[PDB]
């Protein structure tokens with residue numbers, strides 16, 4: 001019955017993917033950012049310059065106050081508000097209604113984006129990283145506890161206005177090609193995984209693989225970029241620079257600040273390398289890789305000119321909190337968050353990213369010794 005959830009995600013480039021939800025009685029309709037990188041369900045509950053609408057608790061006969069404040073600091077942006085519960089539904093999702101925790105956002109700083117078209121966030125990760133603490137049951141745990149929906153969901157995030165699918169409760173085989181490859185969820189807090197090797201245009205970076213997961217690696221749909229730990233970021237930019245030295249770019253470009261431009265249809269894709277991340281597999285000494293194309297880490301941005309140019313931002317940026325596999329890694333893959341079996345699956349997406357002479361891929365098996373040493377402690 002998954003066909004009803006196909007294409008239930010909309011989004012703007014660099015502004016996340018959102019699904020339609022309703023909260024309260026009678027149902028109030030809101031667009032909610034889909035975020036595997038956090039665990040709080042929160043919605044605008046008060047006027048804001050960037051909100052077109054918001055949650056009005058007074059109008060809901062089913063609203064319950066929990067008489068308890070809350071705040072969440074993201075890497076960028078944060079909000080605070082009041083906890084409560086209410087009835088929640090997903091129109092283009094499973095046919096159910098659940099009572100869920102809701103953080104009514106009363107104040108925020110750099111959380112809402114100008115003209116994003118969403119008014120809240122749905123954190124799909126585990127209770128452990130919930131605020132104020134792991135006793136606030138996340139939305140999906142409530143969904144699974146109160147209904148017969150199976151304990152898994154999958155995300156197909158499509159690039160170039162963007163769309164996608166959140167299949168709640170299962171896998172829709174019409175959304176990917178090839179085989180699914182699974183990597184263990186290392187610990188149920190973030191969707192934490194272990195990267196065991198990295199290659200750029202087929203050349204190993206040759207770092208201690210702990211560096212790849214320092215201090216963790218997570219799969220995070222709410223984050224736009226691929227984010228790499230300082231040491232890994234520098235090695236990667238150095239390698240991507242060398243491969244593209246044919247041309248030259250401002251260095252504010254490599255910092256994700258300045259756009260780079262080319263005459264429409266003349267982007268030199270061939271001079272940017274593919275990036276391969278190898279992930280720990282399901283069996284002893286076994287891994288698999290996902291390969292990313294430049295079309296994924298060069299994010300198309302709106303031209304600031306009377307020009308019909310193609311313009312892009314570098315969508316790989318530095319991190320001090322570990323690797324973040326954000327939307328530009330997830331785009332063009334079908335990603336299965338198999339909570340029931342503590343694993344995450346990757347397959348080539350039906351909306352896979354296109355290149356002339358190259359293709360995004362999920363390939364295996366590979367042999368990799370001592371994958372366990374790759375985890376940071």
Ligand SMILES: CC(C)(C)c1cccc(CN[C@H]2CS(=O)(=O)C[C@@H](Cc3ccc4[nH]cc(CC(F)F)c4c3)[C@@H]2O)c1
Nearest residue numbers: 014015016037038073074075076077111129222223224
């Ligand atoms: C567990 C928690 C305390 C929530 C936490 C703190 C720091 C970092 C993380 C990891 N996950 C984070 C990484 S991030 O802050 O870059 C984006 C964030 C989700 C988020 C929140 C508000 C946002 N506003 C605008 C955006 C951009 C998006 F829409 F493309 C956006 C994204 C993730 O959720 C979690």
